[PDB]
C-alpha cells in the first residue's frame, strides 16, 4: 500500500512536470498568427460519379497509388475493384467472412489486404499466372477484431486490433516481428508517416500515441480529447496529425511542440466524427459525420467552408487521391460517390 | 486505335461477366434472414443453438455460425465469442439484422439487474433503434424450484415485489402454483416496462418463457420474423 501510494504520488509529480513544461512551451496560438490570412469560403463541388453494385453498407475503401483504380469493402462479403474513369468493374473477390471492417491496397498494385471480426488478415494475389485472384497468406495472432491495416511494401504490413495492441508482420513467413503495447482501450485507426518510419494511433481511451517502427516503443502521448477517438490522419509534411472523436470535435496536434493547438467545433453540431482526411497541400480538412453530411473545414482559420450532401445514411469512409484530383466517400446506403 | 479496341474488350467481357455473377449472388442474398444471438455466461444460448442445429458449424474463429430452415425459409444466426468485455464498438456491425435474440437466466436474482441494465442500454442505442428484440427467459424450471424452496426471497433484491399483484392477462399453466406465476410475470413485466417506457412505433419486443427441453424456438423465431417483415412491408408500400 505504501509503495503503491508512493508510486502514484511520483506519477502525479511527473504529470505535473509535463504539464508545467507544456505550459511553458506555449507563448502564442494559431489563431493570432493566422488572423491575417484570407479565407477560402468559396468552396463548392458536386458529385461526378456514383458506383453501384454493392449489396450492403460500405465499411472501408482505399485508393490505388495510380489514383485511377480503387478497392472497396462491403459487409455482404465482397471486395470490388472499380475503374474510376469508366466506372467499370475489374475484379470481384468473395470473402470467407462477411464481417469485414477494413481493406488496403498494396503500393505496388499486386495485392489487397482484408480483415474484420475474424481476427485475421488475408492477403490476395491479383496477378497470378492462372489469371485468377486467390488467397496467398493468412496472418493470425490477434485476440481482438481487426480495425485497420496498411502495407509498408510487398513484404510487411502493420495492423491495429481491438485488443489494445498493434503488430508488424513478415508476409513471407507470416510471423509477428514487433508488438506495441501502450494503449488502454480499443485501437480504432492507424496512419503511416510519408517515410514509413513512424505511425500514430488513436484508441477508445481519449489519447493518441507515437511509435517507432524499428525501436519498438512509444515516444509521446496526447490527451486533449474527451471521448473515443475514431479517425486519425497524418499531415502532408509529417510533423502533425488530426483526430476525430465522439465528443463532436476535431483537433490538430504538434509533434515538435507536444501540444494541441486547434479545435473544430460548432454549437449546433451534436454528433460525432467518423473519418478525416487532408487535401494535397493541407489547407483543407474533410470530415464525415454520423449525420449524413460531410463538412469541409479551414485548417488554419478553423471556420467552415462548405458541405457535401447527397448520402442517405451514415458516412463511413473517406479518401483522397495521391494527385489531389478527386474525393471518394462511401456510406451505409451502399453507394460510393466521387465528388469534383 | 488499339486503345479503343482494348477499352471495348475490357468493358464487354469484364463488366458483363461480373454483372451476371453479381445478379446471381444477389438472388441468393435476398432470400436469407440473419439473426444475432446475445446472452450471458450462465444462460443457455449455445444450448438452443445446438438444439436447433440438431433439429435443423464451419469456419469458427470465435464466431459460432448456425443454419436452420423452417417452411423452406433459410435462417443464419451468429454468436460473437472472440471478443473481450467491451461491446460499444463492434455491436454496430449488426445494425440491419432482422432481429436480436436476448437470453436471460431468470433463476438467479443476483445477476438480474445486470441483464436489465444491458437490455436498457441496447434498447436506447442510436444505431440499434428500429431493430426488434426477441426475449427468452431461459431457466423457468430452476426458478420454479427456487421459489418453491423458499430459501431466498425476491424482495431483498427488488423491494417493489412486495406490493406486486398478478395481472389479469396472465394465463398460468395448468399445474402451476400461483406464486411461481406471480414471480415470473413480475420479472417479465420489469423488462416490458423498460421496453414500453421510451420506445416508439418503429420498435417492438416479443417475450417468451423457455427452458432447456423446449423444441419450439425455431417456430417462435419464424413467426416473429414474419410479423416484423409484414410490419416493415406495410410502411414500405405506403399503407401506413
Amino acid at each position, epitope marked *: 500500500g505504501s509503495e503503491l501510494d508512493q508510486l502514484r504520488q511520483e506519477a502525479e509529480q511527473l504529470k505535473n512536470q509535463i504539464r508545467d513544461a507544456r505550459k511553458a512551451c506555449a507563448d502564442a496560438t494559431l489563431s493570432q498568427i493566422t488572423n491575417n490570412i484570407d479565407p477560402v469560403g468559396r468552396i463548392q463541388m458536386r458529385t461526378r460519379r456514383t458506383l453501384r453494385g454493392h449489396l450492403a453498407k460500405i465499411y472501408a475503401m482505399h485508393w490505388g497509388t495510380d489514383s485511377r483504380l480503387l478497392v472497396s469493402a462491403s459487409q455482404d462479403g465482397k471486395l470490388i475493384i472499380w475503374d474510376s474513369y469508366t466506372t467499370n468493374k475489374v475484379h470481384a473477390i468473395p470473402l470467407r467472412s462477411s464481417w469485414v471492417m477494413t481493406c488496403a491496397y498494396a503500393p505496388s498494385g499486386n495485392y489487397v489486404a482484408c480483415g474484420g471480426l475474424d481476427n485475421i488478415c488475408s492477403i490476395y494475389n491479383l496477378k497470378t499466372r492462372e489469371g485468377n485472384v486467390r488467397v496467398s497468406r493468412e496472418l493470425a495472432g490477434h485476440t481482438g477484431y481487426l480495425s485497420c491495416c496498411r502495407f509498408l511494401d510487398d513484404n510487411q504490413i502493420v495492423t491495429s486490433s481491438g485488443d489494445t495492441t498493434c503488430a508488424l508482420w513478415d508476409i513471407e513467413t507470416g510471423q509477428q516481428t514487433t508488438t506495441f503495447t501502450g494503449h488502454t482501450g480499443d485501437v480504432m485507426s492507424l496512419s503511416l508517416a510519408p517515410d514509413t518510419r513512424l505511425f500514430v494511433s488513436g484508441a477508445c481511451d481519449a489519447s493518441a500515441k507515437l511509435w517507432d517502427v524499428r525501436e519498438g516503443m512509444c515516444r509521446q502521448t496526447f490527451t486533449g480529447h474527451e471521448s473515443d477517438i475514431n479517425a486519425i490522419c497524418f499531415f502532408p509534411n509529417g510533423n502533425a496529425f488530426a483526430t476525430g472523436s465522439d465528443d463532436a470535435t476535431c483537433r490538430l496536434f504538434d509533434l515538435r511542440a507536444d501540444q494541441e493547438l486547434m479545435t473544430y467545433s460548432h454549437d449546433n453540431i451534436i454528433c460525432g466524427i467518423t473519418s478525416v482526411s487532408f487535401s494535397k497541400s493541407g489547407r483543407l480538412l474533410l470530415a464525415g459525420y454520423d449525420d449524413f453530411n460531410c463538412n469541409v473545414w479551414d485548417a488554419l482559420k478553423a471556420d467552415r467552408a462548405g458541405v457535401l450532401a447527397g448520402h442517405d445514411n451514415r458516412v463511413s469512409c473517406l479518401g483522397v487521391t495521391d494527385d489531389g484530383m478527386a474525393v471518394a466517400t462511401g456510406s451505409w446506403d451502399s453507394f460510393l460517390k466521387i465528388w469534383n | 486505335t488499339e486503345d479503343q479496341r482494348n477499352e471495348e474488350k475490357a468493358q464487354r467481357e469484364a463488366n458483363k461477366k461480373i454483372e451476371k455473377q453479381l445478379q446471381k449472388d444477389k438472388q441468393v442474398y435476398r432470400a436469407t434472414h440473419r439473426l444475432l444471438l446475445l446472452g450471458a455466461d450462465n444462460s443457455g444460448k449455445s444450448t438452443i443453438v445446438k438444439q436447433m442445429r440438431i433439429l435443423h458449424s464451419g469456419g469458427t474463429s470465435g464466431i459460432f455460425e448456425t443454419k436452420f430452415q423452417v417452411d423452406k425459409v433459410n435462417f443464419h444466426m451468429f454468436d460473437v465469442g472472440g471478443q473481450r468485455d*467491451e461491446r460499444r464498438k463492434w455491436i454496430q456491425c449488426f445494425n440491419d439484422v432482422t432481429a436480436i435474440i436476448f437470453v436471460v437466466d431468470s433463476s438467479d436474482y443476483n445477476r438480474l*439487474q445486470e441483464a436489465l441494465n444491458l437490455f436498457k442500454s441496447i434498447w436506447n442505442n442510436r444505431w440499434l433503434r428500429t431493430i426488434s428484440v426477441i426475449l427468452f427467459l431461459n431457466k423457468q424450471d430452476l426458478l420454479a424450484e427456487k421459489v418453491l424452496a423458499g430459501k431466498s426471497k425476491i424482495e431483498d*433484491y427488488f423491494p417493489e415485489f412486495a406490493r406486486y399483484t398478478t395481472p389479469e392477462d396472465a394465463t398460468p399453466e395448468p399445474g402451476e402454483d400461483p406464486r411461481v406465476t406471480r414471480a415470473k410475470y413480475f420479472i417479465r413485466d420489469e423488462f416490458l416496462r423498460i421496453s414500453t417506457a421510451s420506445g416508439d412505433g418503429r420498435h417492438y419486443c416479443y417475450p417468451h418463457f423457455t427452458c432447456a427441453v423446449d423444441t419450439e424456438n425455431a417456430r417462435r423465431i419464424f413467426n416473429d420474423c414474419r410479423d416484423i417483415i409484414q410490419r416493415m412491408h406495410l410502411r414500405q408500400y405506403e399503407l401506413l
Partner: nanobody
Amino acid sequence: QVQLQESGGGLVQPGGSLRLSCAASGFTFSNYKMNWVRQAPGKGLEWVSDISQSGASISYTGSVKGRFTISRDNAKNTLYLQMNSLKPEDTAVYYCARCPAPFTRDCFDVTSTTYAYRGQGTQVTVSS
C-alpha cells in the same frame, strides 16, 4: 485529461453515516450522466446508482433503496452519496464513473474491467 478523484470514507459502526464526494475535471460536467459502482471483496464490479444530466431521473439498485441518496452540483463539478443506516455488507471500494458519450441515454461499458473513465476509488469499511 479525464480524471475523477474520490474523497470520504473510512471506519464506521453499523448504522452509521458518511458522505462521499467525487471531484471531476477535464470535461463538461453537465453534458454527461454519472454513476456509482463498487467492488466488494472477492466480487466483480456492481452498479449502484445513476443520475441524469439535469438532476431528475434518479435510479438505484434495490438493496440500497431508502438508504442512500445521490445528487449533483453542476456549479462545482462534484457528485455526492449520502450514506446512512450502514450495514456490514456495504464494505467495498467505491468508484466514480461516467458514460462514454455526452448526449445519450445508453451507458454500455461502465461496469467492465479496465474501463477508462473511472476513478481510483475510496475504501469504506463498516465494522465494530
